[PDB]
């Protein structure tokens, strides 16, 4: 799941990531705060056609195929009111559903750098003795979408560590997450990461914090 | 055709059971329920469909009661664990139909039973950032405030269950000396410097 | 200019490179061999929506935005008479036009590889005297969409060299192009390139082939 | 609204003149005709322009002969070039307005006069792959024939105008032995072979 942060009066790419070979149609839902997840349009792909809800004229919802078995809906003309999370959903009896993407419609009151800004700690000099271990912290801080996800690996393996983490507090305008772990005694005086998956984080690419012991 | 849902949330302690309401209403005459629960993730994951022709399902620790001349459909959860804190749907339904979802109940899994233990705090500095450490304690009444003369901010603790079935707290605050700090806590009755713990 | 090999019953996207500030209309035009350049549609920017010809129904052509000032026209559901060369305009007076993007719709028909192969030639001995010069020689084959630019550079420079090309002959199902060059007495032990531009090369990087003494 | 243009091809030599005709018709009563270009690359440039209520529009080495009771619309390209080797489109015409082209007539320039001059072919291989290169030559009257007993195929000649004001020919041809292959040429009729430069 990412996040997507267009500006009102623009055009929004949401792709999801459900791999289905022989699809015959892909419906697309719409879940707000406090409401139900309701099926905007479905899109045939034997015949390539939208069928829309009876809500609203055609010129908003699109379904692109940039690929074979790939699908992306691009809405058009975006208004503060079209913010959610966007689904999408095949039949098989289920109903398989697509993982979510946040869509968030702001009016460009960004104005500076929202990358996560992390300000590490290190464990505590009466804590590695009386214990026979040490904590570290991880705070982040001033980054907008809020769709963030802090996970722990170690010095070189593909394990996840036993992560802490806490409630996505918000400033006056950006928002703030720590997340903390506990390590044993023999396994100490290592690396760690504090990996750190966000949309406006630069390259593209996911930050990578280096812990030392 | 309207799923009703009036149980905004529920809280129920470990290996109990849960039963959750939805108040279902169609004109068909034959009709499936699906129950499906969302992570905090965003994620929908497929818990149990009962058909409306025959008896009630079940599949493993769920469980479906099904009242046909009402209008009530009832979600069971036995054997309850650590990882059922969600929010979970009643939706209501070849391959072109629709699925009419309700509002959605949250379930929220409270710990077991644990006689008390005792904070054993610590601290630990970033040159202006401070943050309170709260290691294993089972009630949670905690009290987590610092002392500093000069204080610019201090958010809220963190209260979040262990892996041991316990507590742990981290409460930061940004101050400008942010070495003569000392974080201090109120729990059970008994208070917990850690100034004890300095030498 | 490049070229699109989408097969039939597919999507294609054309992207203009013409940049604009302040537009309000975005005119899209379709030129085939031996008829007239005409009108598909126009893109209304301050209200986003397509204003069709008096030809076809909504549902074929749709014109997306993916950053401010740029625009790509989404074909849908392409037949085979749906290929030729696509151009978008703008008043300003006169009528600016935007360098091409051929398409071609085929029945996947290629089933290999079809990027262009090189198999270059070296100066016989006997020009190497009596005319105190040389000439290269560098032929490719075997390349499908056509739209090919082969132009000759230095071995460390941005100059473009006096090539002189030949017509893109057709072979049963593929193509062959052969581009060739003439350098005189005192820069002739130096290092030439052969630089190709295609569409079905690897990488999306164009070929650069080096040139011996 | 019609604009018609009934001339497939010209050929005109250097520094000559050439006038390209057009056969617009419409029922507006004030309106404009563009004349654009296209080169082999793809690519339209805006030629002239001829608002149909004033006078005859020139713009350097352009020039528009408007025959307004007429029907009929010409372009004078004055002083050629070699790079005047385009097909050119007429176009008939406030930010919402559409053009209306017609088929469109090619103009392909020719070299001026030059005294006759002599091929001197040269050869050049790549194992199997052979090429016998021309060097330049004015009239374009070539027969570029290889000679091998063991023939696979035999593409055919490029004669193409050089930077000098000649003709340079290559024509390429796959053989087996591709070793005792020589090309021969029978132009202006003096024929030259390459054995008399290859001692």
């Known amino acids: 799941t990412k996040s997507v942060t267009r500006p009102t009066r623009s055009s929004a790419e949401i792709t999801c990531?459900?791999?289905?070979?022989?699809?015959?149609?892909?419906?697309?839902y719409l879940h707000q705060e406090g409401k139900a997840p309701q099926r905007?349009?479905?899109?045939?792909?034997?015949?390539?056609?939208?069928?829309?809800?009876?809500?609203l004229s055609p010129g908003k919802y699109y379904t692109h195929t940039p690929r074979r078995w790939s699908w992306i809906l691009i809405l058009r003309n975006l208004i503060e009111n079209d913010s959610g999370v966007?689904?999408?959903?095949?039949?098989?009896?289920?109903?398989?559903?697509?993982?979510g993407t946040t869509l968030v419609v702001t009016d460009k009151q960004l104005d500076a750098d929202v990358s996560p800004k992390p300000t590490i700690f290190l464990p505590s000099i009466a804590e590695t003795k009386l214990q026979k271990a040490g904590t570290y912290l991880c705070l982040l801080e001033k980054f907008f979408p809020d769709v963030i996800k802090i996970h722990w690996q170690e010095k070189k393996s593909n394990t996840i560590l036993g992560s802490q983490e806490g409630n996505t507090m918000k400033t006056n305008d950006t928002y703030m997450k720590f997340s903390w772990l506990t390590v044993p005694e023999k396994s100490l005086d290592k690396e760690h990461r504090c990996i750190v998956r966000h949309e406006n984080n630069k390259n593209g690419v996911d930050q990578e914090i280096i812990f030392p012991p | 055709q309207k799923v009703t849902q009036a149980q905004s949330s529920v809280s129920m302690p470990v290996r109990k059971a849960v039963t959750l309401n939805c108040?279902?209403?169609?004109?068909?005459?034959?009709?499936?329920?699906?129950?499906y629960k969302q992570l905090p993730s965003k994620e929908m994951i497929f818990?149990?469909?009962?058909?409306?022709?025959?008896?009630?399902?079940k599949s493993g620790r769920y469980s479906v009661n099904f009242k046909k001349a009402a209008k009530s459909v009832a979600l069971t959860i036995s054997a309850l664990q650590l990882e059922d804190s969600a929010k979970?749907?009643?939706?209501?339904?070849?391959?072109?139909?629709?699925?009419?979802?309700?509002?959605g109940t949250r379930v929220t899994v409270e710990p077991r039973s644990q006689p008390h233990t005792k904070p054993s705090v610590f601290v630990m500095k970033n040159g202006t950032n401070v943050a309170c450490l709260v290691k294993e304690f089972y009630p949670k009444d905690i009290r987590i405030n610092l002392v500093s003369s000069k204080k610019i901010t201090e958010f809220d603790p963190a209260i979040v269950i262990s892996p041991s079935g316990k507590y742990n707290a981290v409460k930061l605050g940004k101050y400008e000396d942010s070495n003569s700090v000392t974080c201090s806590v109120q729990h059970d009755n008994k208070t917990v410097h850690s100034t004890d713990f300095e030498v | 200019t490049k070229s699109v090999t989408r097969p039939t019953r597919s999507s294609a996207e054309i992207t203009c490179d013409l940049t604009?500030?302040?537009?309000?209309?975005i005119h899209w035009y379709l030129h085939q061999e031996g008829k007239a350049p005409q009108r598909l549609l126009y893109?209304?920017?301050?209200?986003?929506?397509?204003?069709?010809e008096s030809g076809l129904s909504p549902g074929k052509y749709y014109t997306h935005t993916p950053r401010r000032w740029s625009w790509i026209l989404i074909l849908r559901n392409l037949i085979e008479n749906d290929s030729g060369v696509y151009y978008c305009?703008?008043?300003?007076?006169?009528?600016?036009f935007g360098s091409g993007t051929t398409l071609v719709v085929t029945d996947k028909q290629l089933d290999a590889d079809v990027s262009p192969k090189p198999t270059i030639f070296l100066p016989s001995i006997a020009e190497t005297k009596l005319q105190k010069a040389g000439t290269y020689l560098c032929l490719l084959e075997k390349f499908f969409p056509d739209v090919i630019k082969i132009h000759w550079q230095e071995k460390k420079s941005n100059t473009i060299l006096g090539s002189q090309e030949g017509n893109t002959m057709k072979t049963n199902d593929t193509y062959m192009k052969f581009s060739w060059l003439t350098v005189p007495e005192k820069s002739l032990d130096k290092e030439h390139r052969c630089i190709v531009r295609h569409e079905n090369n690897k990488n999306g990087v164009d070929q650069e082939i080096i040139f011996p003494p | 609204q019609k604009v018609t243009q009934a001339q497939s091809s010209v050929s005109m030599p250097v520094r000559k003149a050439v006038t390209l005709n057009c056969l617009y018709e419409?029922?507006?009563?004030?309106?404009?005709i563009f004349w654009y270009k296209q080169l082999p690359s793809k690519e339209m440039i805006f030629l002239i322009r001829?608002?149909?209520?004033?006078q005859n529009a020139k713009s350097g080495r352009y020039s528009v002969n408007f025959k307004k009771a007429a029907k009929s619309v010409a372009l004078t390209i004055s002083a050629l070039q070699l790079e005047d080797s385009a097909k050119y489109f007429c176009?008939?015409?406030?930010?919402?307005?559409?053009?209306?082209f017609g088929k469109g007539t090619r103009v392909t320039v020719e070299p001026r006069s030059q005294p006759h001059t002599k091929p001197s072919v040269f050869v050049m291989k790549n194992g199997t792959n052979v090429a016998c290169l021309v060097k330049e030559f004015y009239p374009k009257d070539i027969r570029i024939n290889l000679v091998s007993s063991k023939k696979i195929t035999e593409f055919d000649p490029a004669i193409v105008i050089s930077p000098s004001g000649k003709y340079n020919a290559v024509k390429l041809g796959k053989y087996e032995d591709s070793n005792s292959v020589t090309c021969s040429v029978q132009h202006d009729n003096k024929t030259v072979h390459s054995t008399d430069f290859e001692v």
């Open positions: 305009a703008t008043w300003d007076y006169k009528k600016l």
């Open positions: 176009a008939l015409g406030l930010n919402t307005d559409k053009l209306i």
């Open positions: 893109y209304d920017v301050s209200n986003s929506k397509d204003v069709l």
């Open positions: 419409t029922s507006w009563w004030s309106y404009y």
């Open positions: 604009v500030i302040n537009a309000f209309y």
């Open positions: 001829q608002g149909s209520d004033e």
